[PDB]
Amino acid sequence: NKMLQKEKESHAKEIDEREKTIRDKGRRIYELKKKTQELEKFKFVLDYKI
Amino acid sequence: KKKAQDLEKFKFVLDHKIKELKRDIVPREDEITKMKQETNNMDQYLKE
């Protein structure tokens, strides 16, 4: 018991932080999706104006 | 990010020809011109 108590620990904070990183990278994914979408329409708009 | 990069120039540049075509038109419509002065002066010649 004493040796196993010395042994056992961890990885819950790591699970949560990895979920946090998933969250942040999904945030950036959608931000860049919106930026790309904003820039896409202007291409056809400017071709049409030309 | 790369798609937005490949689309930022598409959002900006063609404004270049947007301005260019109008600027070219600028001197183009202009020639409502000396042909009319000729028609006026030859009309004066007709008068006399």
Swiss-Prot record, chain A:
Q: Which domain of life is it from?
A: Eukaryota
Q: Which residues form the signal peptide?
A: none
Where can this protein be found?
Cell projection, Cilium
Family indicated by similarity: Belongs to the CFAP57 family.
Task: Describe, as the record does, how this protein assembles with itself and its partners.
Answer: Forms a heterodimer with CFAP57C. Associates with components of the nexin-dynein regulatory complex (N-DRC) and the CFAP184:CFAP263 complex.
Q: What does this protein do?
A: Associates with components of the nexin-dynein regulatory complex (N-DRC), a key regulator of ciliary/flagellar motility, and might act as an inner dynein arm (IDA) hub or linkage.
Query: What is this protein's record name?
Result: Cilia- and flagella-associated protein 57 A
UniProt source species:
Tetrahymena thermophila (strain SB210)
Protein's gene: CFAP57A
From Swiss-Prot, chain B:
Question: Where in or outside the cell is it found?
Answer: Cell projection, Cilium
Highest rank taxon of the organism: Eukaryota
Transmembrane annotation, as ranges: none
The signal peptide here is none
The subunit field of the Swiss-Prot or TrEMBL record says:
Forms a heterodimer with CFAP57A. Associates with components of the nexin-dynein regulatory complex (N-DRC) and the CFAP184:CFAP263 complex.
Its job: Associates with components of the nexin-dynein regulatory complex (N-DRC), a key regulator of ciliary/flagellar motility, and might act as an inner dynein arm (IDA) hub or linkage.
Family, as annotated? Belongs to the CFAP57 family.
Q: What is this protein called?
A: Cilia- and flagella-associated protein 57 C
What organism does the UniProt record list as the source? Tetrahymena thermophila (strain SB210)
Q: State which stretch of the full-length protein is shown.
A: 1019 to 1066 of 1308
